[PDB]
Amino acid sequence: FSSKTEWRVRAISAANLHLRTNHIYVSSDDIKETGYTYILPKNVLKKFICISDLRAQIAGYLYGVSPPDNPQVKEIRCIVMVPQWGTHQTVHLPGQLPQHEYLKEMEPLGWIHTQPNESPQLSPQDVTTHAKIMADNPSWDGEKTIIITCSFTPGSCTLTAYKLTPSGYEWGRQNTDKGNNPKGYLPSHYERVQMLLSDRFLGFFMVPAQSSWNYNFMGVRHDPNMKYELQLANPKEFYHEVHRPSHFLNFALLQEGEVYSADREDLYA
Amino acid sequence: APRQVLDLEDLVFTQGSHFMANKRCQLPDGSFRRQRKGYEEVHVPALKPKPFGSEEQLLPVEKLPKYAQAGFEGFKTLNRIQSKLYRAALETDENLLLCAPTGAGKTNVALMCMLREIGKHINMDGTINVDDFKIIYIAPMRSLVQEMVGSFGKRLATYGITVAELTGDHQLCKEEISATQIIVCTPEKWDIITRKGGERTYTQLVRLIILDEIHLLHDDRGPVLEALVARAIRNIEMTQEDVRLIGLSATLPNYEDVATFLRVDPAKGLFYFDNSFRPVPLEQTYVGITEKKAIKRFQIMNEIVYEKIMEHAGKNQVLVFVHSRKETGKTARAIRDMCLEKDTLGLFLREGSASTEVLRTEAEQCKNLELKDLLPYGFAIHHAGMTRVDRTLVEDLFADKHIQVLVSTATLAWGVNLPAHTVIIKGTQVYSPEKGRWTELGALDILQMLGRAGRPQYDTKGEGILITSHGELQYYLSLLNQQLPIESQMVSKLPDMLNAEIVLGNVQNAKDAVNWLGYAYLYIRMLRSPTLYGISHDDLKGDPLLDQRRLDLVHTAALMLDKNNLVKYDKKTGNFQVTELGRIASHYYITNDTVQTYNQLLKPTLSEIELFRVFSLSSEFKNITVREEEKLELQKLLERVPIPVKESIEEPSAKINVLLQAFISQLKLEGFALMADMVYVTQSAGRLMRAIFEIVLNRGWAQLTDKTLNLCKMIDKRMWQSMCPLRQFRKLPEEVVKKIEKKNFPFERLYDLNHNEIGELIRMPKMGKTIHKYVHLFPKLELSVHLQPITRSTLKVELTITPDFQWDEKVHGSSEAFWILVEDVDSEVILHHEYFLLKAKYAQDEHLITFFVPVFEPLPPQYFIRVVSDRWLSCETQLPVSFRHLILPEKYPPPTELLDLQPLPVSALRNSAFESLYQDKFPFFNPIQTQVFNTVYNSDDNVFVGAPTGSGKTICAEFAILRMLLQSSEGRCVYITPMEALAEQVYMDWYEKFQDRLNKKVVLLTGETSTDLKLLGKGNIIISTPEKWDILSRRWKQRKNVQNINLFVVDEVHLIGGENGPVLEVICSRMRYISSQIERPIRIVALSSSLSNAKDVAHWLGCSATSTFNFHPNVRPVPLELHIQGFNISHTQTRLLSMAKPVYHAITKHSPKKPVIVFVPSRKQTRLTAIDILTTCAADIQRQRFLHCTEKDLIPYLEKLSDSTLKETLLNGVGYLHEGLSPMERRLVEQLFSSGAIQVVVASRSLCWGMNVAAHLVIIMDTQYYNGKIHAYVDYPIYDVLQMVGHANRPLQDDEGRCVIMCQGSKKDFFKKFLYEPLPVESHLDHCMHDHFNAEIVTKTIENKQDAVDYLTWTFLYRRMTQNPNYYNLQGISHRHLSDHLSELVEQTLSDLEQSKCISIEDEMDVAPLNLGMIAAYYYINYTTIELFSMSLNAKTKVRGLIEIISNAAEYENIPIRHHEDNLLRQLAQKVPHKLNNPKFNDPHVKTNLLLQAHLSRMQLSAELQSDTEEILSKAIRLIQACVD
């Protein structure tokens, strides 16, 4: 980013993200039928789209349970936002997975992220990210956890859901190179999975304890090994004042400017 | 006749206060016109003082009354005019008007008018006791207000009376200015503050208002003064309580018109003095310039300045008023460089080289301003901008005459007072950002600055020189000699004025509107000069009173307000209705075009980017435009702003936006035009942004109310949030702040660090302590929440706010304001919000707020409870409330349908003797009764009947009683009600119903065990309250009279829900246990209001579902119309006061001719509200409308009265009922009401239960009440409210019954939900538990832990626990869940009971009562009480100790604390035999100690606390005996 002009164009843009919110598409494609099927409550989806930005990827972590007596469907009941920052093609979020009390009741279902340009494939950066989570986390089950990619289409939003195949998981554990075309990448690595939106139940948010989630505007304050706690509260928007301290901390001024126009007229209170 | 719409545009006066209504002017005597090239110059000489009249002398400060003389020190004699009117000043309440020239010293006249009132309240042994009166001084200018409070303070200080400026934001300083008298303010301030109601707590304590410089009537600001005074007068006509009004004006014609306006009797009240009375005679010079081209003009005026100034260059003094900031010093240095260009001519401003102190001007050398250049020479400059102290240092220099040339601004004339030998006004034109252009300065500005001409002391006569444009030259003559009419600009503002009056409720309809306008200055002007105001004389003759013009006028205002949605007013009725938009508009003094712009523009989804634009579109800014020259700088500013404007290009929107940002971002601007503009924008911005916040918050749209309150704060504080909060403490160094901003270390992480760890971050350790202070000065709340589900739809939230910050009144001041708002799952919708205000006293005291919130069908992961300071920026705390574990209650089955039955005649029961006690009362039983009948009467089984209060369940009980009557001669029946009042109320009926007619003996239980025992068993029907029937019947095993009862009746069982409910629950349960052991069935009949969970109650009390009748509140014999009225004023006094008028209106609307009961929060409030009902009764022009008999008939009743005011209120048909009234007085009032003599009775809330007289309309006023113990208000218990509502029932006659409940904003939704639906009821036994286990263990009903659990299973708690487990903090609905829960329960109850030595627990299994518990159980005393006794009473204790030990008893904490009982009990405690060790006077134990000693000393106290004393004494002996034991 240009860090001056580049900030503002996208900033007055993102104030319209809520317009997208009511036009969304969902990939319908061939159902494995032996697979799990994930239901995403619409409210969290709306809010998640609304906090995002149209260039930097933001990501969120999925937490849910399967409804009683129906083990093959996973309701996503919660999204957790952790300290993070994006690129246009990927997202850097820390090594620690969410730990918190409200979360103990549910299982992790993977993660969801915004995708500035729509691609009909799981980006190598993603399969690599996911495998590398999975390597370090037994908590995440290969077969149960997914990557939901939410892409910004014109005036719209459109989303797909992927699972790593074991081929993919091994490639990704192995993979170093984060470029858009790493060696040995294959369409054999991922698999699409069945997902539905729902108005039947409401999902909720988990959000960083002492800060907010969006570190894009401080990259030096973000570290892979950084630790965080959580709370029950909603995410602030991308360009929200808090995510942007450096800019509100731009004041170089001498007080005596106030000497000029010392006619104080007030008369009201 | 029907009204017609007119155009208010061509009907106003543009360029107001420059108006010049007369087109002809006059010479003075020796005046001449001499025209030069390019400029006409007019000269008038000084006036000739009127020769002293025969035997007319000045008054010294001696010969005027003794008291007032104080504070006049330094002044030996009164001014001629002061001396003229002092008599009427101090000897009459007649209103005043004086017209006297500038310099006559008008203030000291008005001062006397104040010293009279200050004297009206005086005592011998104390002076000027200050809570009787307050005075309001309205002055036109701010500087003038400041300086006036400054000197008034000094002067009046001898009296010790506290006078202050009213700059207060409404809420933080009200309770501050509560203690303030003689408050000074600008008319505007008074108008907003009255529109909000900050005044309505002050008024009626106001006997005097001063209008100073009332000629401001002619200014655009005029309508405000017109609005003030009109309101004051129109109000006095309603209240009949009068006020003095003292007007002060410059000398101008239309004096008699202003007189009419102020209701000044021209005879004794009018005072006029012409321009000859100026203390320093004024020679007037006026030079108008004919030059059209401005380029040549800006030379010509320079040169006129030079010649005029060189004229006085000898021994004399000149003062130049320029209207520019910078040009104060641009005008100087022109004179200087000219004097240098003069070949050193004009110089030597002294008597010599060294003479006249040129070393004075040289030795003062180094100064803050540009003075260093000018000071070595003869002249200098003055203004507010460049310096603070050096202004005072220049004023000192001018007074002592070391500078004979001073160029300055109008704020110098309006500020601290110094004159000049001759003053010169350069140009008269100023820049008006409000008007968007340049305009000639106001009347008061010149009048003030030219009234500075000449000294009172060092001068002979003053001169003044006004350099203006020739075209305006006529105008400025019509002023400074009295030619100018004072006219009203009121028409321009008429739509805005009307709104605010509807908003205050002072105008309901068109008629009240014309009545109001009939009090305006514009009215008398339209009367006496119709030709000017747009009325031809012929149609004036056609309508002499202007009824049809005042009807046409205001009709257009009504239409404008309707079209912008400030008011809903239909032409047919002529009535107005206020909308919240209207209120917001009035409260912020924002125009009605701006507000509709906001209505259409504002949507939930608005970004900051857009919020600013909407702000920029405010109609208040309509004339602001963007100039070519400044579009160069605006672009730079546009790229240096944080919030993108880029939606807009260069147009007014952009200019205003970038300006607001510039101000917040704190940016200095090169152009002067832009500076003034920016100032305008930002000053109006506070009110504007705030009205936005209020609107958008009332809508409930969370995100935008955040963005808008934050904007408000950013405007107030002049910074963005991205800057360190420490900046709001201005006490802090800038470099330190910038330093902590340098390193990014999130602010809330400063609390973890100590004084040293702080300084280590910025490597400035010397600061380490001071920083720390501020970090802990910054307001911080921590908050906890206790949440329990009520119904599947609603949860209850108890928020506990604990102050985490160190209070300093030099920072936080008297009060700190916080919004608490609970937001939904996405932080999208605001489900609920309250305004919470923590006062000074109560920092560190945790406050408890209780409120309900709804839940919805996709049950969400959590809500959020947000709390944010109003004024404080970056100060917020959020609290996730997680539902992850929430278990919602089982949805409630539909109420049993009301069957359609042939209404049962009394002829049903075949018993004639029974028929007799009904037939002559009502012909038919109601559908409820007739549906219950066969089950309750012809059949023997337990029934439950819920129906909402007013359904007639009492005779449903009487059915069962009659059945038992047939069953046996001696048949025994016990009847229970939770309210003792209700019990006596039942007894009075049933004693005649049964004992009188049916010969069957009827009794009513009492305190004493013995007498009570004897009572039952002689009686067939035993009426009692749960506590009386607990103590007796705990021992039931031994008392055969308990066991042998045939029937058992529980009335109002839903009351289980409330406190003193557990005892009810426990006695019904016990009753069942007895029927278990007695082997005979004991029929139980329970009666409740509509109950959602009635099933549980029935299952508990053993009713088959077939005999269970639970009815919906919509089933009532007489239908009810319920209305709820929300009031947004949180401060309870103001709220309670502002619902006064609505009460009257609620009567006139809902029940004009029918009986009306009004319930009130306070014992005393009943009087006051009866009064107010009568005083606003006069308003209607309708007097004594509520009295239905002649005064001759009421005399026999009034002979029995003590209370004198009650006589009055009764005389007009009202009357009241409360604690203090003698039972005869009460009986009388009740009689008068029911008989139909008086139509309205105001009653204390306490009397809702025990009142035997019903009504048609019931109005509940303000559902909160005051509790001294936590020092806060607390809501009416819901069942109470339902009872008050049920008090509107008149089945005999009315086809309907009506209720209006006026309550706070917060409490609105709660009533909307729970008054209509059937009610849920939960058990409280889990909390109040020990006492009963103890007592029961004593009877050996619980022999061991097992028996304890078993006992638990007989309760209603047992029933409910699995129904709504989250309420009882039971975490699962399972079997072992409930089992483990009850287990843990008896476990800890028995443990706590064993710790207290009331029982002994053997083997861990068995239990036995011990000494303590035995005592407790015997005397029916709380167990903690006698434990306290156990650790308190020692070997050496005596009556001194026994008093306090018996006082701390638990049964004495039921004793409450009333409004300001902290001083009362202190005054009593002073004079009692035994003093106390640092007693807190809000504590009921202390109060009972003091009341007890008072009783021992036979001191007669007020009946208020005497009642209390009696109640203490009632239960005293038992406690005493327990101590003996």
Per-residue b/e over A194-215, b at no fewer than 16 CB within 10 Å? bbeebeebbbbbbbbeebbbbb
Kindly list the distances between the CA atom of residue A130 and the CA atoms of A141, A228, B1282, in Å, as whole numbers in the listed order: 11, 20, 60
Kindly list the distances between the CA atom of residue B1234 and the CA atoms of B1127, B1144, B1238, B1241, in Å, as whole numbers in the listed order: 32, 20, 8, 10
Chain A residues close to B668, C-beta within 8 Å: 253, 257, 260
CB of B206 within 8 A of CB of B243?
yes
CB of B284 within 8 A of CB of B464?
yes
Are B748 and A199 an interchain contact pair (Cβ–Cβ within 8 Å)?
A: no
Token representation of residue B699: 């809508």
Return the closest-CA partner of residue A253 out of B735, B959, B1473, B278.
B735
Chain B residues close to A267, C-beta within 8 Å: 142, 186, 188-189
Q: Rounded distance, CA B197 to CA B1132, Å?
A: 12
CB of B264 within 8 A of CB of B247?
yes
| DSSP H or E stretch at residue B98 | strand B96-99
Chain A residues close to B641, C-beta within 8 Å: none
Instruction: Check residue B1367 and report its DSSP letter.
Output: G
Are A205 and B647 an interchain contact pair (Cβ–Cβ within 8 Å)?
A: no
Kindly list the distances between the CA atom of residue B645 and the CA atoms of A15, B283, B656, B659, B663, in Å, as whole numbers in the listed order: 13, 55, 10, 11, 15
CA angle B404, B409, B415 (to 5 degrees): 90
Annotated binding residue B652? no
Token pair 């200055």 is found at B521
* Ramachandran region, residue B348 (left: φ > 0; alpha: ψ -120 to 50; beta: rest): left
3-state secondary structure of B1110: strand
Q: Rounded distance, CA B1514 to CA B814, Å?
A: 42
β-strands B39-44, B282-289 pairing: antiparallel
CB of B1479 within 8 A of CB of B1487?
no
Chain B residues close to A218, C-beta within 8 Å: 744
3-state secondary structure of B829: strand
Are A242 and B411 an interchain contact pair (Cβ–Cβ within 8 Å)?
A: no
CB of B381 within 8 A of CB of B328?
yes
DSSP string, B1016-1051: BTTBSEEEE-TTHHHHHHHSTTT-HHHHT-SEEEEE
Q: Rounded distance, CA B1273 to CA B1333, Å?
A: 34
Instruction: Name the residue among B385, B749, B860 with its Cβ closest to that of A262.
Output: B385
Are B825 and A202 an interchain contact pair (Cβ–Cβ within 8 Å)?
A: yes
Q: Rounded distance, CA B1143 to CA B1133, Å?
A: 16
Token representation of residue A11: 């900033």
CB of B276 within 8 A of CB of B50?
yes
Token pair 């630790």 is found at A227
Q: In the β-sheet with B1216-1217, what is the strand arrangement from edge to edge? A: B1120-1127, B1297-1304, B1257-1261, B1156-1160, B1240-1244, B1216-1217
Return the closest-CA partner of residue B1445 out of B186, B525, B764, B1436.
B1436
Instruction: Name the residue among B609, B683, B825 with its Cβ closest to that of A12.
Output: B609
Kindly list the distances between the CA atom of residue A96 and the CA atoms of A60, A226, B1011, in Å, as whole numbers in the listed order: 13, 7, 75
CB of B658 within 8 A of CB of B648?
no
Strand partners, B1303: B1126
Give all strands (DSSP E) within B1230-1327, no chain letters. 1240-1244, 1257-1261, 1264-1267, 1272-1275, 1297-1304
**Residue B107 CB coordination number (10 Å):** 17
Token pair 């509790």 is found at B1267
Residue B67: half-sphere exposure toward Cβ, Cα within 13 Å:
17
Token pair 């306006």 is found at B261
Dihedral pair phi/psi, residue B689, rounded to 5°: -60, -35
What is the gyration radius of the CA atoms in chain A, in angstroms?
21
Return the closest-CA partner of residue A206 out of B884, B1291, B361.
B884
CA distance A197 to chain B (A): 14
Q: Rounded distance, CA B203 to CA B209, Å?
A: 11
CB of B1022 within 8 A of CB of B1016?
yes
CB of B714 within 8 A of CB of B866?
no
Are A102 and B862 an interchain contact pair (Cβ–Cβ within 8 Å)?
A: yes
Q: Rounded distance, CA B529 to CA B1524, Å?
A: 91
Are A246 and B722 an interchain contact pair (Cβ–Cβ within 8 Å)?
A: yes
Kindly list the distances between the CA atom of residue A42 and the CA atoms of A197, B199, B826, in Å, as whole numbers in the listed order: 6, 50, 11
CB of B840 within 8 A of CB of B821?
no
Rounded to whole angstroms, the maximal C-alpha distance in chain B is 133
Q: Rounded distance, CA B1470 to CA B1494, Å?
A: 11
Residue A244: half-sphere exposure toward Cβ, Cα within 13 Å:
18
In the chain, the amino acid numbered B844 is Q
Q: Rounded distance, CA A237 to CA A53, Å?
A: 9
CA distance B392 to chain A (A): 15
Kindly list the distances between the CA atom of residue B1004 and the CA atoms of B405, B989, B1035, B1257, in Å, as whole numbers in the listed order: 97, 12, 20, 32
Chain B residues close to A8, C-beta within 8 Å: 644, 646
3-state secondary structure of A148: strand
Rounded to whole angstroms, the maximal C-alpha distance in chain A is 78
Return the closest-CA partner of residue B931 out of B1063, B1108, B1086, B772.
B1108
β-strands B1156-1160, B1240-1244 pairing: parallel
Return the closest-CA partner of residue B40 out of B352, B288, B240.
B288
Resolution (A): 6.5
- Please report which residue ranges of B168-275 form alpha helices under DSSP H: 187-196, 222-239, 255-261, 266-269
* Residues B1157/B1159/B1162/B1163 CA torsion (nearest 10 deg): 40
Residue B189: half-sphere exposure toward Cβ, Cα within 13 Å:
22
Kindly list the distances between the CA atom of residue B543 and the CA atoms of B315, B334, B515, B523, in Å, as whole numbers in the listed order: 64, 62, 16, 14
CB of B43 within 8 A of CB of B463?
no
Pairs across A and B, CB distance < 8 A: 163
Query: Where does chain B break, by residue before each gap (C–N > 2.5 Å)?
Result: none
Token representation of residue A164: 């790593």
CA distance A155 to chain B (A): 16
Return the closest-CA partner of residue A67 out of A59, A76, A55.
A76
Instruction: Name the residue among B610, B676, B734 with its Cβ closest to that of A15.
Output: B610
CB of B525 within 8 A of CB of B259?
no
- B487, exposed or middle or buried, with CB in 10 Å at 0-12, 13-18, 19+? buried
Token representation of residue B1164: 């005393």
H, E, C per residue of B625-690: CCCHHHHHHHHHHHHCCCCCCCCCCCCHHHHHHHHHHHHHCCCCCCCHHHHHHHHHHHHHHHHHHH
Q: In the β-sheet with B862-869, what is the strand arrangement from edge to edge? A: B830-839, B815-823, B862-869, B876-882
CA A269, distance to chain mean position in Å, is 47
Are A232 and B666 an interchain contact pair (Cβ–Cβ within 8 Å)?
A: no
Return the closest-CA partner of residue B909 out of B938, B941, B944, B929.
B938
What is the gyration radius of the CA atoms in chain B, in angstroms?
40
CA distance B1050 to chain A (A): 43
**Residue B120 CB coordination number (10 Å):** 13
Instruction: Check residue B992 and report its DSSP letter.
Output: I
Token representation of residue B370: 């540009």
Chain B residues close to A46, C-beta within 8 Å: 826
Q: Rounded distance, CA B1334 to CA B1397, Å?
A: 11
Q: Rounded distance, CA B1199 to CA B117, Å?
A: 38
Token representation of residue B1139: 């619902």
* Residues A67/A71/A73/A77 CA torsion (nearest 10 deg): 40
Dihedral pair phi/psi, residue A259, rounded to 5°: -60, -40
| Positive or negative: CA dihedral B135, B136, B142, B143 | negative
Return the closest-CA partner of residue B44 out of B445, B443, B465.
B465
In the chain, the amino acid numbered B1066 is V
- Please report which residue ranges of B504-591 form alpha helices under DSSP H: 510-517, 521-528, 530-533, 537-542, 547-552, 555-563, 580-588
B838: CB partners within 8 A, 6+ apart = B801, B803, B815, B816, B818, B847
Interface test with A, best of B752, B823, B862 (most A CBs within 10 A): B862
Token pair 């209020």 is found at B694
B1182: CB partners within 8 A, 6+ apart = none
* Residues B83/B85/B90/B92 CA torsion (nearest 10 deg): 160
| Positive or negative: CA dihedral B535, B539, B540, B545 | negative
Return the closest-CA partner of residue B406 out of B364, B377, B365.
B377
Dihedral pair phi/psi, residue B785, rounded to 5°: -140, 140
CB of B1461 within 8 A of CB of B1508?
no
**Residue B852 CB coordination number (10 Å):** 19
Chain B residues close to A248, C-beta within 8 Å: 642, 720-723
H, E, C per residue of B12-59: CCCCCCCCCCCCCCCCCCCCEEEECCCEEEEEECCCCCCCCCCCCCCC
